[PDB]
Amino acid sequence: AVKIGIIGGTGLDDPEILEGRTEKYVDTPFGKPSDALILGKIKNVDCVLLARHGRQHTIMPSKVNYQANIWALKEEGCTHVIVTTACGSLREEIQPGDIVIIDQFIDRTTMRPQSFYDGSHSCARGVCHIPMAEPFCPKTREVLIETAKKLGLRCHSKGTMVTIEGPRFSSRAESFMFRTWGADVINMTTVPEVVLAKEAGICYASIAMATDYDCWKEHEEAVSVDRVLKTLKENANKAKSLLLTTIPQIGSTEWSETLHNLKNMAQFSVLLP
Amino acid sequence: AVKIGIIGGTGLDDPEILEGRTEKYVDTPFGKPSDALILGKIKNVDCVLLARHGRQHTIMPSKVNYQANIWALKEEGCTHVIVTTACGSLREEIQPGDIVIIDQFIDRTTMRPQSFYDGSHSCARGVCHIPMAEPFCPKTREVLIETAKKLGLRCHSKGTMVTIEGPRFSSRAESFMFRTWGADVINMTTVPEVVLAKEAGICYASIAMATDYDCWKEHEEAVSVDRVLKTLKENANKAKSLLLTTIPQIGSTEWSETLHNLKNMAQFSVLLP
Amino acid sequence: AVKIGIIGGTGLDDPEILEGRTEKYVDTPFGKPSDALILGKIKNVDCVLLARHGRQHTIMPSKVNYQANIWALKEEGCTHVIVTTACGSLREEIQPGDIVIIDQFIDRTTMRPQSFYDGSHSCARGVCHIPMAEPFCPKTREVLIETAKKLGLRCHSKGTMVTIEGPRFSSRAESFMFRTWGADVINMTTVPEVVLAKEAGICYASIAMATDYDCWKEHEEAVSVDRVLKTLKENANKAKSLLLTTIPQIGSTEWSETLHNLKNMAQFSVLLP
Ligand SMILES: Nc1ncnc2c(CN3C[C@H](CSc4ccc(Cl)cc4)[C@@H](O)C3)c[nH]c12
Ligand SMILES: Nc1ncnc2c(CN3C[C@H](CSc4ccc(Cl)cc4)[C@@H](O)C3)c[nH]c12
Ligand SMILES: Nc1ncnc2c(CN3C[C@H](CSc4ccc(Cl)cc4)[C@@H](O)C3)c[nH]c12
């Protein structure tokens, strides 16, 4: 069965869009999810919705309960998780408003749990070393790409997200260094969400929306909260249209082989006594 | 009004120099400052002095209470914070003994709180994402530069500090990598001091004194505590003269616009419910 | 006297090999070592054996008690610590099965104590800033090199280990970035083991065994637990032969000057009140 966890800036909740809406507060072995899971049906496909920074944004990216979020989506039975994220563009040709279907990351985070297998829980015994060669679901990305071209939206079919610890924005020196590293976009939340998704055997893809060019331009104002907020307001419909047209397609594709493979990868990543 | 917090290796305390000296032990929402604040007047300008690693240097750079230090200077009413720091040179042309008026950093730290807005305190509610495009006060740096040329001291008008976690020094591989990154000087304390200063709406500049060339030279002894200590002893007067001649000038400049701008930046960085 | 702590994948325990075997559970100021120290004699040289991830591998590289391991070896009286480690090759010419006698590292770790001098213990008072220009014992490496050529084994006489936090493997973007950085091999345990060894005045060298090429190859399967495990099984005898032929030689060399120098370096790294 297809069940799609959706994380992020999605006005997808709900009434016209979400049929059979149910609000469910969840307690996981890793503590509390960011907010109540919102459960329902979007065009006859089972979905689960989750606001990353909580009821009206009160928790910093560093202190987001990533373990609880992923574990709670898996336990509802999600086979997919498709997320949305604001990001800074590190390249001229990724303009604010553009979607980037990222395919790689570089971790610049420092204070974040990145495994369920942390020694502390009976649900996750042993040590897990999960492969990250292909951090993002190949077939989901493809649908995301096909669908954005169907929508005639500006879109980059690939890209490397650098995830900074934050909550501060980058210095200029840092911005230029990530440029030399070959990173395309920058955020605060992609790691460890994607790593925990893979540990859980979930197919996970990210819709990244560029909102600013960070601070690397010498003659333009550098990123701020207010500039990200207004760009994000202007452009939020694109990520929303992309998901409404994507979700029909996911629920009408063959998935058993991808999910079987993802399950074995996660299974065989773990070392028991 | 002008009030200048001064952090670091400053024999500025006191008797000839500091008029109207007062020792004040402070308790902030973020715990204890590194040491008692020493309060007084240097050439008719209100100053506040603070030893970064405590009464006779007992705390590692990683465990320095950066939140408490900055918050306590702000609460005394500082409009400026000008700091001094030892550093390793990552370029031949920055010789030991040289001052670098840094203008950028690269964060290599890992275990450090970098925001007052951490979820825990009523004085700092919401999430703060502070811009870091220009981490250091433009007009203060300028005075620092003008004044060092007035002193005929060797000086670099700009520079990128890499801040390592420590307390160890860098491996050679690490030293060469920061070189390829375009870093000029290296230390253990610049981040998060500067980031917390900006969150507080304080104009903050750093006097960086090169003490060694780290370990990148193939045919010279690599950095050690004793080599830094003796270079620092030989060269400590330069940073002291620079501040005595700088402090008159700060207290005689126009500041209201810079501080208004810095206040709005900090104000508009924060997200409430 | 020579006493050699040996950490890692060593079937050196024991009966044919280890004379006068004794199992000793130890309590250090920094908590418990990874496992019981196994104590005895290998070709008439006093050795101490220690399994890094514990009795049948149950602790993640991030949560390994590095402070306890090193401190317990020092307190038994080790003058040397020679370790073995699996690693990913970041260069074509380092083939799986090859030994790399590493000589440098780059730290990509984030959540790890890296000093005994942490403020908390009477055995380690003050702040320690240990030089890392030459993180690995020069004369031990040399014996390791000479001995591998005597064994006619494939061997790289130098190399830069990047130590990632883990427990996940690297993304591809990350793999390529460490390549551009000039790293040769990749692991999860080298830092802070080597840094704590130096703080302790112990001569410390690493036998690194390449087990995989991580994920940088476009047309080969990326690293997994099972691929590392089988390569490691196939190649484990090489690291074992290298140590049996190395250990005679260490116990028959002049060491007093190296250890005196290493002791002064550690001594003079520390700042008391
Ligand atoms: N240059 C940049 N650097 C790092 N991250 C970002 C991001 C990504 N997030 C924006 C956000 C800061 S602004 C914002 C916007 C809406 C709301 Cl409700 C709350 C806050 C952080 O979660 C990271 C966009 N541009 C970035
Ligand atoms: N190559 C290098 N790398 C990192 N940091 C530094 C530093 C900066 N600090 C020196 C200092 C180590 S030596 C010292 C000197 C005086 C006293 Cl009272 C106490 C200790 C650390 O706080 C970082 C200088 N050279 C450096
Ligand atoms: N590409 C790579 N990246 C990071 N580390 C490694 C390592 C080094 N270790 C292997 C090991 C993962 S696989 C393994 C093997 C035997 C046992 Cl008993 C338990 C687990 C981690 O400790 C890091 C090899 N290849 C690596």
Short mmCIF file of C-alpha atoms and ligand atoms in Angstrom, two decimals, chain B residues 53 57 61 85-89 162 164 167-170 186-189 209 211-215 223-226 228-229 232, chain C residues 129 271, ligand 2:
data_model
loop_
_atom_site.label_atom_id
_atom_site.label_comp_id
_atom_site.label_asym_id
_atom_site.label_seq_id
_atom_site.Cartn_x
_atom_site.Cartn_y
_atom_site.Cartn_z
CA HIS B 53 39.53 32.02 30.13
CA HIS B 57 43.26 30.60 32.67
CA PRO B 61 37.96 27.36 24.72
CA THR B 85 42.97 37.10 20.50
CA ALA B 86 46.14 35.13 19.87
CA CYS B 87 46.17 33.29 16.53
CA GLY B 88 48.22 31.05 14.26
CA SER B 89 49.19 32.60 10.88
CA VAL B 162 39.21 29.75 11.15
CA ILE B 164 38.72 25.23 15.54
CA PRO B 167 41.66 22.28 22.75
CA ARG B 168 44.27 20.46 20.61
CA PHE B 169 46.20 22.29 17.85
CA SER B 170 45.54 21.25 14.17
CA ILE B 186 43.43 30.29 13.11
CA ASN B 187 42.05 30.27 16.68
CA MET B 188 39.67 28.65 19.19
CA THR B 189 37.41 31.46 20.42
CA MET B 209 47.63 38.80 17.12
CA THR B 211 51.78 34.25 17.53
CA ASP B 212 53.02 31.32 15.40
CA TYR B 213 52.56 29.87 11.94
CA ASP B 214 50.74 26.79 13.24
CA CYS B 215 52.37 23.73 11.72
CA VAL B 223 53.08 25.63 17.32
CA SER B 224 53.18 24.85 21.07
CA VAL B 225 51.79 26.43 24.25
CA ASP B 226 55.28 27.71 25.19
CA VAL B 228 52.55 31.05 21.76
CA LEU B 229 53.19 32.22 25.34
CA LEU B 232 52.48 36.74 23.13
CA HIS C 129 46.71 22.12 24.08
CA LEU C 271 48.50 25.10 31.70
N1 LIG D 2 47.96 27.67 15.84
C1 LIG D 2 46.93 27.98 16.62
N2 LIG D 2 45.79 27.25 16.49
C2 LIG D 2 44.69 27.51 17.20
N3 LIG D 2 44.67 28.52 18.08
C3 LIG D 2 45.79 29.27 18.23
C4 LIG D 2 45.96 30.33 19.10
C5 LIG D 2 44.93 30.94 20.02
N4 LIG D 2 44.83 30.50 21.43
C6 LIG D 2 46.10 30.19 22.12
C7 LIG D 2 45.68 29.29 23.29
C8 LIG D 2 46.67 28.14 23.41
S1 LIG D 2 48.20 28.69 24.10
C9 LIG D 2 47.93 29.69 25.43
C10 LIG D 2 48.42 30.99 25.43
C11 LIG D 2 48.20 31.83 26.52
C12 LIG D 2 47.47 31.37 27.61
CL1 LIG D 2 47.18 32.45 29.03
C13 LIG D 2 46.96 30.07 27.60
C14 LIG D 2 47.20 29.22 26.52
C15 LIG D 2 44.24 28.85 22.99
O1 LIG D 2 43.30 29.64 23.74
C16 LIG D 2 43.98 29.31 21.57
C17 LIG D 2 47.27 30.78 18.86
N5 LIG D 2 47.84 30.00 17.92
C18 LIG D 2 46.95 29.06 17.52
#
